[PDB]
Assembly symmetry: C3
Homo-oligomer: 113 residues x 3
């Protein structure tokens, strides 16, 4: 169970923190959306939330990552929601397949149900 | 016609403001993108804009929400752009199917056409 | 080779900077993801990064843009990653098909591999 602080960025000016799949997974379009496990857990730094997006090279190879929100106070495992677009996609254990981007969490007076 | 201030968040640290469909709608993949009505209208708080994203549990059930930008000065009805991925999807009136996330609107000198 | 400063926004309160395709391109669903060229190059203003999203009217006409991250220090050509959803899509040279949104780049202590 690793916290977000263990993630790395490709370059100093890279916006995304790369996420790996902890399992070897084969995906086909007929399977629809699948939740890939990353081994990384919330919560996030104060006053931030996360967006999970695909890496461009992975998108171009036919694996679509559906953008996901990581809440500031989420303490579960970060999953990547993904679907093979056209072809059979093979995700090997350790392949970096998505990235976490951190964004400011704006306060509002909206009610909390 | 309800303003964004009427939306609610799941938990204090939830980044998204949940959006419902005001109509019962059936969707199939052959239909392609459909615009679902929410009953909620812009504009947004000063110096912010909005992103519309799917809820993860709804994405995993096979309804893809295409991410959308809500401009600061949009005064129309917020719609959710959605497509059934693989299967028939039935959206009941009142189902929360997407979420609005508020983000800072950065000023630049880019021209305004 | 044009910098981001040359882009325009639809209205003063429009969050997105519109991106055009510099080539006439036909797309079908069987083709999967294709990278469209825009003629516009990073890098981005200090302390910002970019998200590339579809325009809503273009999404509703059946061209899906996969959201992409533009890093602060990217100096290559901004491309739009796109797929025809259901039908044949014809992108004419000069059609505005996506938009760049600028967001704050949050600093963290994550390591840089
Ligand atoms: O891609 C994702 C999206 C969400 N998540 C986790 C973290 C986020 O805080 C949590 C809930 O996200 P959403 O609000 O998008 N899902 P939903 O509205 O279905 O669940 P909840 O009712 O708990 O808010 O799911 C992921 O791990 N990966
Ligand atoms: O998912 C969405 C996306 C956009 N919208 C509305 C609000 C946003 O301010 C407005 C215009 O969004 P885009 O700029 O993405 N669309 P487009 O560029 O086609 O229209 P315009 O030329 O008016 O900017 O459409 C939604 O209601 N839901
Ligand atoms: O839609 C996109 C996404 C990315 N890009 C460019 C700019 C961005 O800085 C760069 C790298 O993006 P990602 O980190 O998403 N791709 P990946 O992780 O495959 O490459 P790298 O290993 O270089 O980080 O690709 C685009 O031009 N359009
Ligand atoms: Mg990268
Ligand atoms: Mg939620
Ligand atoms: Mg627009």
């Amino acid at each position: 169970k690793q916290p977000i602080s263990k993630l790395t960025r490709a370059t100093p000016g890279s916006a995304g923190l790369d996420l790996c799949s902890t399992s070897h997974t084969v995906l086909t379009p007929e399977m629809g959306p699948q939740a890939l496990s990353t081994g990384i857990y919330g919560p996030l730094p104060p006053n931030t939330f996360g967006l999970i997006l695909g890496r461009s090279s992975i998108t171009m190879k036919g694996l679509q990552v559906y953008p996901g929100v990581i809440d500031n106070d989420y303490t579960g495992e970060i999953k990547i929601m993904a679907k093979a677009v056209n072809n059979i996609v093979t995700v090997s254990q350790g392949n970096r397949i998505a990235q976490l981007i951190l964004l400011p969490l704006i306060e509002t007076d909206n009610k909390v149900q």
